[PDB]
Amino acid sequence: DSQTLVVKLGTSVLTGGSRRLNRAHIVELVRQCAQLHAAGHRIVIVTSGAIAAGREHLGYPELPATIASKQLLAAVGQSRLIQLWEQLFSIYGIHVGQMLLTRADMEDRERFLNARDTLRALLDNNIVPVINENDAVATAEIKVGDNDNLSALAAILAGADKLLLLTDQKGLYTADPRSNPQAELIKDVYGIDDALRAIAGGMSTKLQAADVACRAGIDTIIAAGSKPGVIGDVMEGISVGTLFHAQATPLENRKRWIFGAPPAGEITVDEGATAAILERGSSLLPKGIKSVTGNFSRGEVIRICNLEGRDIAHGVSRYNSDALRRIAGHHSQEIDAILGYEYGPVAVHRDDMITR
Amino acid sequence: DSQTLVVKLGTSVLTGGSRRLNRAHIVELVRQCAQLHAAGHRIVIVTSGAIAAGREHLGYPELPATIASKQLLAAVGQSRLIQLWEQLFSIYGIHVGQMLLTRADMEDRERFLNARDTLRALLDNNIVPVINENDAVATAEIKVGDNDNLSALAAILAGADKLLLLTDQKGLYTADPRSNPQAELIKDVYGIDDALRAIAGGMSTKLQAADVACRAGIDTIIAAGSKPGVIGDVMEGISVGTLFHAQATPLENRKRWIFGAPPAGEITVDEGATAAILERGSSLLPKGIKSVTGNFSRGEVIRICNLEGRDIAHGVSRYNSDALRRIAGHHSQEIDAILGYEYGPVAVHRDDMITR
Amino acid sequence: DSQTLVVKLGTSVLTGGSRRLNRAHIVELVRQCAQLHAAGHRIVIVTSGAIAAGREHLGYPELPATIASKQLLAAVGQSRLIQLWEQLFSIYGIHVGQMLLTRADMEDRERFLNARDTLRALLDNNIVPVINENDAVATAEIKVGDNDNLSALAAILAGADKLLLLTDQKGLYTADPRSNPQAELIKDVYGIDDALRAIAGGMSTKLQAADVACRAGIDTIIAAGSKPGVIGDVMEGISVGTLFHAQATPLENRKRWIFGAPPAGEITVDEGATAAILERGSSLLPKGIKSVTGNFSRGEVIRICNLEGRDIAHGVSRYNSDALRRIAGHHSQEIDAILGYEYGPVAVHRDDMITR
Amino acid sequence: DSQTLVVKLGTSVLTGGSRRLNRAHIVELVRQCAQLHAAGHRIVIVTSGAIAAGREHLGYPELPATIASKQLLAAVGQSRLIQLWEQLFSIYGIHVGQMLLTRADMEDRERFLNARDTLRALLDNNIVPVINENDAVATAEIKVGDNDNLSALAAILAGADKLLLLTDQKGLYTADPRSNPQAELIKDVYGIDDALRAIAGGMSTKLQAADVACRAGIDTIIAAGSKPGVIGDVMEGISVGTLFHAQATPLENRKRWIFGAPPAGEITVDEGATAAILERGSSLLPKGIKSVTGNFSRGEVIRICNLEGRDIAHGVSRYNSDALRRIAGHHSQEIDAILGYEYGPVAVHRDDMITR
Amino acid sequence: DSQTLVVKLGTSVLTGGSRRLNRAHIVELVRQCAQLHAAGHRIVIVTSGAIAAGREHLGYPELPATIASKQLLAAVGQSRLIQLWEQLFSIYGIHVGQMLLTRADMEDRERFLNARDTLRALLDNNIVPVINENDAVATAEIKVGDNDNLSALAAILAGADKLLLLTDQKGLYTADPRSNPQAELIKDVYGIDDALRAIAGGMSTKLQAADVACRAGIDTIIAAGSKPGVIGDVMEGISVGTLFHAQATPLENRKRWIFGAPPAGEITVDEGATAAILERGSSLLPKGIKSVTGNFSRGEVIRICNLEGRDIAHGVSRYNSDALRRIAGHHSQEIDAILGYEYGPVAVHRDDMITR
């Protein structure tokens, strides 16, 4: 059925090795993405090339060879890059959204929940998210990587099924193709070991991204951007590059997410909502909450118990402690009236909750 | 001579109170800003209206009344808003750079230094920075404020001389103008008092922003965006609204910045660089550094001591501890060869240093 | 038993804060009102949203930001708003009548009596009156208030027992709920004081309306429109928001109405009608009138004296001086033949008369 | 060129003598009106039949034979009447606005200005105003007249060129057509004499309306509603009924309007605006006003002088005294900033001024 | 995840036993359906009550007691019924489509495919299909059943997961509830036995519909329309009436559909498309077709073999034999050029194929 694919396109794929973005290759890839999008799939694009767009837009000026010059070029050219993406996608009647994320945002619980919420909102409305790194405050991908770890983090955030990394090479080779005439492309890989890290070598960052994505239960595909119909075959299942299989299930990833750290808060729930959670496996509404203990923000993991005090679930909170205390015992429609804002009608969602 | 002005435009000023952005008012304001820019002044723009631009771009769809819907609209419309700013400013031959900042970024030392570096790079290249909140990860300004506190933070980050906030009203009135025919506009304010807070009230967020900016040594002017030539009059010195005077000097703000927290590390400096720092008050080059103690990141405040151990200065570090250790004792031209990147030829700048 | 409730719905409640009217919320409120109506209660609705309905009907055109544009939108959308109310109420088999009133109409005695007669005729025929401001001639509520004072005037005109105002917030808080976690909702209020005005602040117009209604002997409840079953709970007596108790009895309000101004005229009454007025306290028929002095219109307060000249009552006149002179001494069944119209068989009603 | 026609349709024309509104005749008349509207003319419709619509909608119930029953029927059926008008006009792609006016509103200066403003706004946007009497507060037209004087007042308010009254008779006859075989239809009338009032006689109210309209400089045409193409021929100039010629010019009417009463206020104007008013005959902007004397509301006649004190003009004021004092000496764009609302950029319009 | 529910509402549920449709009950049920629709489910409504709407619209005339009178009433009132459904659903911002189906249409292969195509198109675009019987040509449901078998056929056509029949009774009872105090509602039923038909008895048609639906692999729920939240509980899984479990899987139903009759035609397929069909299970494009044998229409079952003549699949054809012959061997984008119309890019869909 419907699937989620995260396509990562580097600077070499977008420019083709030249000093300018090659719009013909990008329009071919956009055509493939639109073909997939029309069939009901969800597409997330992690892009680079803001520095190239800024350099072209400014007339290729002479700047100091420092990080600040790259930050300036990225700041000037992020607008041009997103404008190009929107213009190319509007040919096929598709809208494009812009998200600027950093690793620190992914590490923060509240920021992670906010980013996941806006990404889900974009995906539910048939809008393609285009994701880059915020180069104003973070300079990690400028120095090394070129949005490689950002792609893995975006795949984890989007709940993707596949992560396709497009590069200039065809994939992973057992030996050097030039030196060894018998060197062959590796078809499937089950776990990254020291031998693969040694044979791989520019390909180290992609290997780290693949390891991170596969440890979270996402299948990674390293392929060549110039191969015709690469995105469509990746979605269908045809082998086009190197395939790294998921080393875990999504349930294991959710277990690690919930139980990685001790709960930040403690909430008590009446009998009816306890029965709804246990027997029916449904979400937790603010009506059933009786007491709120602890000082925690939105997105933190809290412990849900019954009136007797027995732990019954662990789940992430969609509201911080103060809002939960203020809206406890009320109906959903009143939440906005109580707070002036609304995150949704549930306090703890069922997909973010693990029953103990 | 040349000064720095930060102009804050809310959604009410941009849309004129209507459904969509009014480009005539924005083009008049851009004309005034370009007139100031051509005279050698530096202009920073803090703006809103990404949600309105996104709603107009998407055809005004029907969406749930949640925060995620506003995040989606902001993501879709940030590109359109920056496109509008770029197109309006290019009429006068001015380039525009986009920066997305949050309060957490300003609080963090490393992110603050990165953002200040990119803003300075933009300003020294005759590029107008356009600053908005990163709505994907932060929702503080969506709920309340409309980029009011962000304006003060950007004024502090840019080292601005004036912070002008454009609103619907003409300024601050002692009494209600409708009820009291004798009510008059307050011209000058020296400090924020409880009586001023009570009589202010929509203006509470502007009052907080003015207090924050004035405590940092920046004059804050609340004026009406519809006043003809308001920006030029503000920059020249003509009374146009309510003016809040700085309650501190920039030197006091630098002292509070440096000495607010204990130093994160310590670095020893040879006799030549000690004489340069003390007698001449110059920046600290990496060649003179002899040792590095502790683990600190870029942007943290460290203690500069001499060979005898007598503390001589306190200053923020342009490199983290590891890079400082690697490039200690080397010439500046080799920095990029040693690290793979360069932040500049100085380890601690003279304007970031306080001599003890 | 049967009671009169006046429900005031603002534009925020009707549209949900969005661009267009939200018919689901209005249908829920109409369901509650119909449930009350079927039980024998009388319901009066004061509404807004003519401008929003007109803007939606016209295709959201681009208009000058003047008062005349809002007047045009209200003129276009009043018909659509009344159509929506009629269609929603006819689901439950209830008819809807439209009344357009201004403050000047309420101030005038004759127009007040005409409007009260219309409202009473509507209420005795199981027809729900829907009251809005006549935006063609009056602009007071367009600028500020949103039919808040008009709600109090309609409650006074209808002889209502309760005036419920639906807003976005839950009611009145002693402290700011966001800033102070210990802030709590005020349940009951006995009189409007300066402390209440200071802590209230958007709610100032509601405070003025509550003061006006309570000075006339009507209990005013400020509640949230999104609260489930708020109308039924209000009518039963359950606390749902902030309650302001009546500071006068309806008898005191009638005394203030009758004796606020000097009588406009004097009429002499024979012995039989004098005995009916004094001993039995019945209405004054035109047959008993012997003379009419002065020139007054319908709805003015006049002095009823006996043949000996001793003043015996003060009451409002259902006919002007000329009609009273023409129909004096005649039977009530022939009023229409003499005048060409009939206001009823009584000259002064017993509930509009105070016996001296 | 373009003209303004006010069509008055009574209950007999709309119903055809039956108990229900005849939609075929109304659709024919609407077709003629739409033909005129498409050619660039401005059409204003003064209508009746709210009581008939209310009677039909309620199932023809049994009600007391009083004025309050007629007010109830009008309140219920005004919505139905305006809905019918809108539905019939939307066949030809024309929108319809609703205005409820009374004679007291026309007699009041501020209410007259508000009504004229909303009518002009409706006419400028290609919207047909449909005008009836507010039967909730006024009962004059219910008793006698059937919107006859209201039509003359609406023609005066709209600045119409022609007022066409449609009835069942063909016009005015010299003698009784049935008794006298030589009785002929009067083609033209120049002033109403006692002989005309005697020969006319149900036709007295139409004669009063024609006299009122022609005394204000508007040509009146009394014709039969069933005559094919009566509206088009009236606009073209073909004789179809009785024609009453204007007894005055519009300039005389404006002179009477300005100088009917002593000025309510006094304003002083600087030299530049004085020169603009005198030699150029332009409107008066708030920038040129120096002082404001007196307490007057919007729509009142005030005296405009120069700094020397010599009277230079008399004109109606678009703002009341307090607003004029608050916006005196400012620019137009700031008006909305100062007052919170705007009536337009001119304090006194050029078409409302008489130069002394 | 997302599910498909077919709700069947009889005349008794819509009218409540009276002579008119009860819009309050229908609006409650529509509110529940809209709540389900907003959550991503697909809702199909099989309705009755066209005769009641026609009787009400015509004023309840006197007609002969024949079938033709019922056909007349249904023809007049189908428009009114669909208008009522659309008006009630537009409160929640949902569109409604109208389909008139008969049993003969379901028995015909081409008509079945056309109806399934339009139903799928309506469901994919978030439009609620409202289904009734075409009473102009078919009179089966008029005589007996009241859209009971039509509901089962619509559930089979829509590929629904649940079929909920709403009636006035609470469900199926073991004995007569009034005669036997111990009579209890049957909770679950696994297959219809002669004992069930004997105990059931007006409930025979519902039993036949449940048997037909469950033999095709659809769970049936017989419940009471007046029970609050019956639709939501049915979707969730809460027991609210009598539950008839599916006696077969959807795969068995597809096997019966394909292999019920001998194939109507024969088509040969090249090697590439044969490989795509066999080991990948993909749809059959017109490019791979080599030869077409037989005379069959669209929707018939045909046999797909390879060039060697070995049978490889059986599937229903989306094009008739002539169109398939004309578009054989071409690309998909030129189907419209060749034929002048298009049914889609696949000759045989993958979900309609059984691989031999």
Ligand code: PRO
């Ligand atoms: O967009 C760019 O070009 C830089 C490099 C990767 C992250 N930001």
Ligand code: PRO
């Ligand atoms: O751009 C906007 O509209 C929102 C509000 C301020 C920050 N982001």
Ligand code: PRO
């Ligand atoms: O109906 C409206 O929208 C305006 C505001 C209140 C009075 N008229």
Ligand code: PRO
């Ligand atoms: O509309 C009607 O029928 C009444 C009579 C004229 C004025 N109002």
Ligand code: PRO
């Ligand atoms: O709609 C109706 O009322 C008839 C009876 C069921 C099928 N058609």
